[PDB]
Design a protein around this nucleic acid. Sequence first.
DNA 1: ATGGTTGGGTATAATGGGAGTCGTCTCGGATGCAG
DNA 2: CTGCATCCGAGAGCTGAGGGAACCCAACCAT
Lengths: 260, 1361
Amino acid sequence: TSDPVRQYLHEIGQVPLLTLEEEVELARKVEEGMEAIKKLSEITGLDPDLIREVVRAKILGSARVLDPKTVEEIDQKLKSLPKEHKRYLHIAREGEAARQHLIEANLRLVVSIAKKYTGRGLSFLDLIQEGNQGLIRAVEKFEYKRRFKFSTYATWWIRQAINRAIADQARTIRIPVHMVETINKLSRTARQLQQELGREPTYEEIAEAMGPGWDAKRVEETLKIAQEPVSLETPIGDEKDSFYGDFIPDEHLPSPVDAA
Amino acid sequence: KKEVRKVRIALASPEKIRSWSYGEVEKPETINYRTLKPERDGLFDERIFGPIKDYECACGKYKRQRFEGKVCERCGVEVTKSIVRRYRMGHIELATPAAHIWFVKDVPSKIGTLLDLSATELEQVLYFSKYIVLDPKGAILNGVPVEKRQLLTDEEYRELRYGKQETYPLPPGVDALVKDGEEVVKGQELAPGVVSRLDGVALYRFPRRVRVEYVTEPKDYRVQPHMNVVVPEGARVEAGDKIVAAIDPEEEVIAEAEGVVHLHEPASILVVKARVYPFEDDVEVSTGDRVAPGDVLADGGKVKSDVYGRVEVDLVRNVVRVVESYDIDARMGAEAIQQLLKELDLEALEKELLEEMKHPSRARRAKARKRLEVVRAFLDSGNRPEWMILEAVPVLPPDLRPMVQVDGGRFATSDLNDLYRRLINRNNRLKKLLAQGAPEIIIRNEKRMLQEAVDALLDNGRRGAPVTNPGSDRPLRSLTDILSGKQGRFRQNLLGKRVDYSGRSVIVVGPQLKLHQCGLPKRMALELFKPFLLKKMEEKGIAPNVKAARRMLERQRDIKDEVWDALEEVIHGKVVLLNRAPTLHRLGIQAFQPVLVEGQSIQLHPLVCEAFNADFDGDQMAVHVPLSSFAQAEARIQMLSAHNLLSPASGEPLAKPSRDIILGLYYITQVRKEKKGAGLEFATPEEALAAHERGEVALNAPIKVAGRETSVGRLKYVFANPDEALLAVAHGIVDLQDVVTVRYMGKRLETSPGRILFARIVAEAVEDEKVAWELIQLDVPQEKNSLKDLVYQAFLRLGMEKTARLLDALKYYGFTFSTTSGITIGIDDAVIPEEKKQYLEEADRKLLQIEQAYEMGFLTDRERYDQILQLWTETTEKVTQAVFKNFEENYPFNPLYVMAQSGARGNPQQIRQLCGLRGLMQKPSGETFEVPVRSSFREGLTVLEYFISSHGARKGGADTALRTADSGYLTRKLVDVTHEIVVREADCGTTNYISVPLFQPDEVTRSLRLRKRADIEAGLYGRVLAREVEVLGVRLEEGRYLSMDDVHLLIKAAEAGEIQEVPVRSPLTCQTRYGVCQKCYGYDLSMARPVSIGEAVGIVAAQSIGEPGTQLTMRTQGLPRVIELFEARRPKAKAVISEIDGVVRIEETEEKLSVFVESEGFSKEYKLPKEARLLVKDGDYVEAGQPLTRGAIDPHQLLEAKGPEAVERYLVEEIQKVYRAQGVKLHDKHIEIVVRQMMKYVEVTDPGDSRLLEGQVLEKWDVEALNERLIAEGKTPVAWKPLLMGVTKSALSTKSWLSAASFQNTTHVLTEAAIAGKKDELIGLKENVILGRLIPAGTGSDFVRFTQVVDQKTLKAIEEA
DNA sequence: ATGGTTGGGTATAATGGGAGTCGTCTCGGATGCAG
DNA sequence: CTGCATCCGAGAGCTGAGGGAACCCAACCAT
Ligand SMILES: Nc1nc2c(ncn2[C@@H]2O[C@H](COP(=O)(O)CP(=O)(O)OP(=O)(O)O)[C@@H](O)[C@H]2O)c(=O)[nH]1
Ligand SMILES: [Mg+2]
Ligand SMILES: [Mg+2]
Ligand SMILES: [Mg+2]
Ligand SMILES: [Zn+2]
Ligand SMILES: [Zn+2]
């Protein structure tokens, strides 16, 4: 019942893995479904993405909640098309189903990759979900014509999504991605300098070890903006009666003396 | 501005929440990392919540007032006060609905009760573990049709929604016994190692080779995973056509000639349950479409569907396959729960439950009633059930979840910000995933995470593992955590606050102070009265302006002399409040006039230390300053120390002489006894005088002259008046303790000069000689009890002002005479009697005997142990008696003896430990040792004896430590249950009363023995006589308040057999709503006069009960017994009582024992354990509710048997027993008030012509009013039974949701009140305190608070007008 | 017109987690046993 | 079919004082 990680693992494990034939088959289906989408777009003259959405809505079914009226009108706006040039629509439906299967089958690689990113400010399930987003992107961009295995192309996208989510969401005060990379590089450099020197390095040593464009003052500013806020509810003392925010005075509202 | 009169709480609709919000929070950003300004659309956005600066937009275009209500075009920030940042709310629009955990996890669940779903089913559906069916659409599961409100697992839903399509991996290089496209029954083997299990068609998957004929001869083509087969099985081919397409153009397989095609070595076989339809032209339904029987598929309608299923058009074989499925509509989570909630029709459900409530089954009726409670609450409040599912989540204003820069430049934030950030991140990710057409597993996981995030925001640490911040184990503080607990909003910021104009300091004895005065340090007073001092400095020439006065007062070295005189003028006539924690009763806060002193210590009067429970070993006290005229008047009239002289709990004096004062008065009022003469015989006084001059007889020896006892002092020294006797004392002729003859008040008194001096002290204090002579007891030494009686009599006869004068005089003279008396403690003052040695040897004798009796088989282990214990107990008692006999006979002025006898300090047990012996000690297991400590504290203990006593010392310390907490909790519960009870009217008009008995049955059932005087006083003093009483030719009229003299007269009449019980009014029989009346309460015990209308007697009762319990009552027995009685707990040592009347017939077998109660109608039986002890005998008569065994009686069984009155009397008597055992004086009224609140409710047995339900608990007053109206209309009255519940359950069942929520169980109270839409009418004190209003008690009572005052001149002018 | 910020991309193969906690008492739903 | 009977889980245990872990590349709004 509880422990949602076990529930999610059970639901992913209920889906069997894939062999080479099945994986290549599904990838080829996805590619031809996209080509069929574009062919049908050219035939009807309409926007390809909207017809893609109609195919996705029809596959997902009524169960999944663009409205039913519009998609129904375009659905019968496509059934009117004659044979020989109609196959495209069936191929698009099949390809979308293949995309769903492929994602469902490759969900476990996301967990395998994400299990080694815990302890960076994001919970395990959040990392898993962001890895799933990266997996969807990799599925969309995968090219089976190169005869590479799917996981080889999927791992890069999963890692990129997880890293981007960590850089974006780990801090209460959002710090841009380039600045986050700068902070990580600074910390790693400081750790290497401490390992070499046998003691905590000074800011000038870190500035020298970063390279051109770095002085001790800039390192000081970077460490200043990398400080994370503390909780107003941090317990002070042994008894559970004193919090940190109990020691912080209000400096905004005017005092009775000031008002007088 | 209209006055606030009621507060209502109710569920909030999504429309209401969206109307609250000033904008949607779309981003989890808080502030920018460079500029430390709020981020747009974030949790701190000025566009949503308001500007940080007053009258200034974000971009600075407008920075001035008059632009109120104007929104800047560039930045979107309104121009207004910044304080709106603590009022303006936001909201989050959830992608999917989420359930409010309060209505899910508070047992029993409101949503589960409404939808008839168990907790397990609700948890399974809400957190995406099982589906729930809506509109099954004619689906079949395992041969049984599916119905609404049915729970399907993931497997059952997947089978029903899609179908069965199993795949079997054919081993490499093995062909299958079956062909592609052939129906396969269950069990039919498809390979040498594969056996099918489901029915339907088999389909080849990835054939490893293709055999293509050529017009004939065959040929083989290998099929690798990286290539696919295009031509369907059993289809001819042409020259040049391709069959097995490959990725590489050179790898493609083009057919050389015309030939048939076959596919072999399939990688796997897919067995499905489906129907098949070939076609030869354009088809109509594409892949992923669901069809019904008889629908057009292809061939212009030539083929038609025969079954329900989903259509997939496989172009490889040019065949339409309908996989057996349904369009069933089963959903998961809060969306499904909300859909079920909106379809609910409450009136039809109410009718169904009313029909169900007619079942003979009691359990069914109880379940229907429980569901009906919720249904009717929703119907009455007008709330919609679907509002229990959230669509928009409100967002607290930022100023109540601040992100602030600490003085050190770092940032500090609230946990609510992190919870909101998690919620927003998960919602945004869910929206993105939905916009991407993600598979259903990912969407289900994301929705589960969103539900968990909402739960964590509302109530963290309730379902599952609590959310914590990384790197710590500390749970994040949710809104529920903020609301509830000892540190929550209610108990920490609403029922108690930190205040201005207050200080604290160590306390020092103030012996030169008057009763109404306290010593206040100069610096403390200057800080406390600073604005008044500034005004006074402005009035004088000390400062040109208030700012200059403040600057001058800022620095210590800048203060002069005249400011102190200005301060002395400021405080003239004003009072301050002194308070010592813990405040156990109202006397813990008292008003005093401050006298400015030097130093840093508060000076306290010695006579209020007992009321404060204050000593001078480091105690600290707090000082508060009442500001306005009303506050000062209340402090001076009601809370002045000199106006509070009697205890509100018992009516006995509370400010009284103690310690050194008692010692001095006793020393001067005790008389010498001498043995030199020892009853000699004399014929004439001259012979006695000559004998005394010769040295043969002492001055105070009891001699006999002329047949009358006297002494030489009485004959030798005869004084004309007290002045002559005291002048002789001043000359050393006689001592204060010598017995002489003095002429006073026209009489010749054989007394001592000290007693005459005490009489003069009293007479000069009260400024009345005859009354003072009447008050004092001349012929006894003045000790604690006599002094207390004198103070009480002086109060009654003269008033509190003269009583205060007398108290001050007694204090002064007691201190003066204690200083010069010569009281000291030396080691030789702990006199060891000689008898002890003998008493020890005697004991050492019998012990040997005991050992003999154990070596010869005559004694067991238990018998010998008990005999030794008894012997040592009796030896200890003998040693105590010997010690005190030695003190009485030989050293009557011994310091320890005088200290114990006067009541100044010490009790006989401690003195025995000092002098005689410590005695027996208890092991940590609770059993006694066999050897006692035979050494006293003067002799010195050995190491082993000291270690043995350490067990008891430690146990006593731990006892104290737990007891104080348990008593505090009990006192809080009592305050919560009685806080609304006020004296609200003069007379309720009732004719009911209670009968206080004067005789109690004996423990040996011999006869009725007269009760102790203290118990009768505690039960009778101050009460109003309900009926006229004639005793000893004295007529006590109806409506008379019983004074102490009347109580004594009643006791005297009872001792003469004229009366057996007294009928009096009581709170148990009062008819006043939310309180009592003046007559049913009686005296205000702190004033010895009828109670004033408006007195908060409930608080007084709770404090009176709770104060002694702290420490006084030891810890079935002690404080646990009192707690068990006030909570109405069923005893674990429960006794057996008779439910009906009848005669007793004990039926005993050698294996079992039983008691039959045989009435004239029926004969009942009671089986009890044989080892028990019976209070009844064969052939006896027992009434209903009488006990048959020893032990504590269950109050609920007594309520069923005898009724309400008997249970009230039992509870009162049993609670008073514990307090009497400890020696605590406490009036019955307070316990009666608490018990009256305990018995406040009834249960409906038959509704009659009412809308009530059977078994519905409701207030007794409300049902009586309902019955009165029903009788007025002429209907069938409601039938009810009384109920009894403990203080906790009675307090939690009140009408006011504010007090119940601030008491305990906050989430349950709040959710029930919100469901019901309850309105709080602000009747009690706690609600008005929470709202910061004027409490309906004391000066805030409607009886007195509209009084006007005017002079005669102004009144006449208005009269002329 | 410059820096700071943001969106997109990487191709051998990779396929179900991990810390933890056992020394408290009392009272009201509830599943299980019998009749 | 009812009833009682252990069984589990949920909500409590005085106040006051003092206590503080990848890197790179290119287009694009803001200032
Ligand atoms: N609210 C609390 N007050 C306490 C606590 N411990 C001590 N105190 C207070 O401090 C006081 C300490 O009392 P002592 O142990 O000195 C004994 P007391 O003066 O009452 O008696 P004698 O020794 O007979 O003179 C106690 O009466 C309370 O007023 C506690 O845990 N809670
Ligand atoms: Mg003391
Ligand atoms: Mg003390
Ligand atoms: Mg004389
Ligand atoms: Zn602006
Ligand atoms: Zn009354």
